[PDB]
């Protein structure tokens, strides 16, 4: 895989770094540590505040806003690591910036990074 080529989304495997909702993921796919696509693993704490990215779904031709909420309060999972950066801006535009630990709002004030969920918020149109 050419690291430098245009990123190509698929809609066939959520555990792979080129799954379509993973367009601006940074960290680890929660599905790989007992979470699911859009839910956190047991024992971890779910952020309410995140960076977002609009990601193109090849199955339906629509762009959707993905909210990359982190699951927090656990050491990093070490499993299914990925870093994509579609539309990703530097830290002075935090709302689209993905090196940040998007743990704000998690229960118990958890701020360590475990993994990242890829839920849809709505249309990016």
């Amino acid at each position: 895989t050419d690291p430098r080529a245009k990123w190509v989304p698929q809609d066939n495997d959520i555990q792979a770094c080129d799954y379509w909702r993973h367009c601006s993921i940074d960290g680890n796919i929660c599905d790989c540590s007992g979470g699911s696509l859009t839910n956190c693993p047991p024992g971890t704490k779910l952020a309410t505040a995140s960076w977002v990215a609009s990601c193109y779904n090849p199955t339906d031709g629509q762009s959707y806003l993905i909210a990359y909420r982190d699951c927090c309060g656990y050491n990093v999972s070490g499993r299914c690591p990925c870093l994509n950066t579609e539309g990703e801006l530097p830290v002075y535009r935090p709302e689209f910036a993905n090196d940040i630990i998007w743990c704000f709002g998690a229960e118990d004030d958890a701020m360590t990074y475990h993994c990242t969920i890829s839920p849809i918020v709505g249309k990016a149109s």
Partner: protein
């Protein structure tokens, strides 16, 4: 990184389900999952991570080859898993400035579906034994109400931890003996420098009562740090460096030595065959079968991985199978249900290979299990 077949199936079925939700216009509402109810095919993998100051446990569905949860630990923790699936726990060690500063030893009990801690019990004066991980250095009693852990220095001792009341009780002074195989709320056996076992029975207070067995092995015969013990069977299965296997029946709370059994043939032994690995032996209670990791190796590479597993009837010593594993395996264990899985962990690949115990076939695997995973723990739910 590299995806197992089990991962692809699962990640593909998960992709399709999500497409179906998005099509039906069903909104994503993020929440925190619970793991499924513990079952016979739940398997835990602990990663001591080659002596890292922080470590991880992976909770895995062995039937599916899925990571269903994880639990964090500090420095060289000791994992335990209640046989009835009611809780999991470890004895762990942290420091105030990563690997230096004040040391806290503590026991944490977790709920096995939510994985939340339900107790955090400090152990006064840092008394845990820091050693590459031996499952029988920290042990539950049969009712799960007590955790015993070994102390090495300054003197041999066993700590009593009341899990039900969530309090450290006391240190019991013991002879120069190692490992803890509990048989009751207040009785446990240990293996001694002199080749005897010690039975240790303790009250509420006072010095324990200590009863030694006959010496059961000579001094030039070396008993591995990873024996198998079925608490429900009271079977202690202890291999030596050469694949000789001592069995002690502790089911009565007194030790009845069983005939020795050679896991390897004289021919194999003349040909350089010996056990080697970490968790070198497993025992299946209902089938009464021993599984031992073996290969051809020099006599002092006893910690290296093996590529084979021999299976033997524990009652007769008759060989039932010899499996070629397909990988470098450090640790084995089995599930305790009727048609058990055979778990085979590679510390170098950081992968759990899951095999059919009967035919030896690799069914599925689970990779990316930390830095140096070494310990496999199962519940004996039956």
């Amino acid at each position: 990184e590299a995806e197992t077949q089990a991962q692809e199936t699962q990640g593909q079925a998960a992709a399709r389900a999500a497409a179906a939700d998005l099509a039906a216009g069903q909104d994503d509402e993020p929440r925190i999952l619970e793991a499924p109810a513990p079952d016979a095919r739940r398997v835990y993998v602990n990663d001591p991570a080659h002596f890292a100051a922080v470590t991880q446990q992976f909770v895995i569905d062995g039937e599916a080859g899925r990571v269903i949860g994880m639990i964090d630990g500090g420095f060289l923790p000791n994992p335990v898993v209640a046989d009835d699936g009611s809780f999991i726990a470890h004895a762990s060690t942290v420091f105030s400035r990563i690997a230096r500063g004040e040391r806290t030893d503590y026991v944490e009990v977790f709920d096995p579906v939510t994985l939340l801690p339900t107790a955090d019990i400090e152990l006064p004066d840092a008394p845990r034994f820091l050693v590459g991980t031996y499952p029988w250095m920290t042990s539950l009693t049969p009712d799960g109400k007590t955790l015993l852990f070994y102390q090495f220095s300054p003197a041999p001792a066993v700590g009593v931890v009341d899990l039900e009341g969530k309090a450290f009780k006391r240190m019991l002074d013991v002879p120069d003996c190692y490992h803890i195989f509990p048989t009751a709320p207040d009785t446990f056996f240990m293996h001694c420098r002199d080749g005897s076992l010690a039975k240790v029975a303790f009250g509420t207070e006072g010095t324990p009562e200590i009863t030694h067995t006959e010496v059961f092995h000579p001094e030039d015969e070396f008993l591995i740090n990873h024996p198998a013990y079925s608490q429900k069977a009271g079977r202690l299965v202890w291999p030596t460096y050469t694949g000789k296997i001592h069995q002690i029946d502790l089911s009565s709370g007194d030790a009845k030595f069983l005939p020795a059994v050679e896991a390897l043939t004289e021919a194999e032994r003349a040909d350089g065959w010996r056990p080697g690995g970490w968790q070198q032996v497993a025992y299946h209670r209902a089938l009464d079968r021993i599984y031992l990791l073996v290969d051809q190796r020099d006599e002092w590479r006893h910690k290296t991985a093996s590529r084979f597993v021999v299976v033997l009837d524990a009652k007769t010593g008759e060989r039932l199978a010899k499996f070629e594993m397909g990988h470098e395996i450090d640790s084995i264990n089995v599930s305790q249900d009727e048609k058990p899985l055979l778990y085979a962990l590679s510390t170098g690949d950081k992968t759990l290979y899951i095999h059919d115990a009967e035919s030896g076939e690799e069914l599925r695997s689970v990779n990316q299990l930390g830095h140096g995973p070494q310990v496999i723990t199962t519940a004996d739910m039956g």
